[PDB]
Symmetry: C2
Subunit: 222 residues, 2 copies
């Protein structure tokens, strides 16, 4: 197997359950070399006030992109708009192949101009978004989907909006055993039942997003 360098750009999790820590563990478990850029603090009550220097994120980006070839990148929480701009500009200049964006910033405290910058500058540089029902609804400015039919309608609308690929996570569906739906130019796939990092790490080892999502769900199952 060839060397795959995966980069996670997300919040730090002091407990290690999520954030760049869990992303790096997932990268290593799936046979990829992991780099990380901390851009926020993952929430655990509410959070206390803090800020992230965009120059701190920029120095981290200098370190990663001067040293190794980045094959794929997961993106999570970004604390402010300047950080969004810096991430989008670096990904544009280096043309990272597979960018999976966890849309946690949607439907969530955080600055609204950060979400605006995400819409304007970062989404063009993203190969795949993995929104849940509230995040997809906020991204389309539409009522949240209640059925699989509405999920597929919204996934097709997101594809038409410009996204290269969408993985609509249906867990918020009122029906138990909620499926995920993958929408790409090659079609639509239903999936039955960490995730963004697994997708980023596994995408180079496949020819499409469908097999990538399949193997990622298999790993996340056991």
């Amino acid at each position: 197997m060839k060397r795959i360098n995966a980069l996670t750009i997300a919040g730090t999790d002091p407990s290690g359950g999520a954030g760049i820590q869990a992303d790096l563990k997932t990268f290593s478990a799936l046979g990829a070399y992991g780099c990380s850029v901390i851009t926020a603090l993952v929430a655990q009550g509410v959070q206390s006030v803090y800020q992230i220097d965009p120059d701190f994120v920029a120095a981290q980006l200098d370190s990663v992109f001067s040293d190794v070839r980045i094959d794929s990148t997961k993106i999570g929480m970004l604390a402010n708009a300047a950080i969004v701009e810096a991430v989008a500009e670096r990904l544009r200049r280096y043309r990272v192949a597979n960018v999976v964006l966890d849309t946690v910033m949607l439907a969530k405290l955080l600055a609204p101009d950060a979400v605006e910058a995400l819409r304007q500058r970062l989404l063009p540089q993203v190969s795949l978004i993995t929104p849940n029902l509230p995040e997809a609804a906020a991204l389309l400015d539409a009522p949240p989907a209640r059925t699989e039919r509405e999920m597929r309608e919204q996934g097709r609308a997101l594809l038409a909006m410009g996204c290269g690929a969408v993985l609509m996570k249906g867990g918020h569906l009122d029906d138990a055993e909620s499926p995920d739906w993958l929408f790409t130019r090659e079609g639509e796939q239903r999936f039955t039942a960490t995730l963004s990092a697994a997708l980023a790490a596994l995408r180079p080892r496949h020819a499409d997003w469908a097999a990538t999502v399949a193997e990622a769900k298999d790993y996340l199952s056991g």
Copy 2:
């Protein structure tokens, strides 16, 4: 084996070779559960300018110390004096058992009041420091040691200064196969040939620092 929760408080390393990333990997490899608080950016040319919000470190500390019982803690680079104060105050209030301080801030850009705060507030809360020859010399305000005799003199002077335990890393000695020297109230031990994190993770599983250092060096060897 009982559950041991190790906390690393140090810089983030985007490449993963050092910093909290390598500390967490060492924690997990040595059978300890790892938490992390990012307090700086590990250097890789010189570094670009950035700052770390002390409120960001404080929010991370809130997250860690509200959730799990911390048995040991490694401390690395701290970016400014306010961060040093916050770390020292939290460790004092929670009385963390085994605090291993990597003295990278000594003999190193960084604010001098950060080093002053390290001397004033943090050193009383530290169970073990692991200085190399320049760091120990700067901590004692003395010429760097050139012989093992001078190493042991400086280790004894550091013990008399108030440190509970010192691990003088002798790698900077002009003679190859440079040894390390452990100085505690129970005596002195010579050792022949990551490290701070290994010491933090392994100290709860022993009755003294000598066996801890022995097993840590054995792990770091192979």
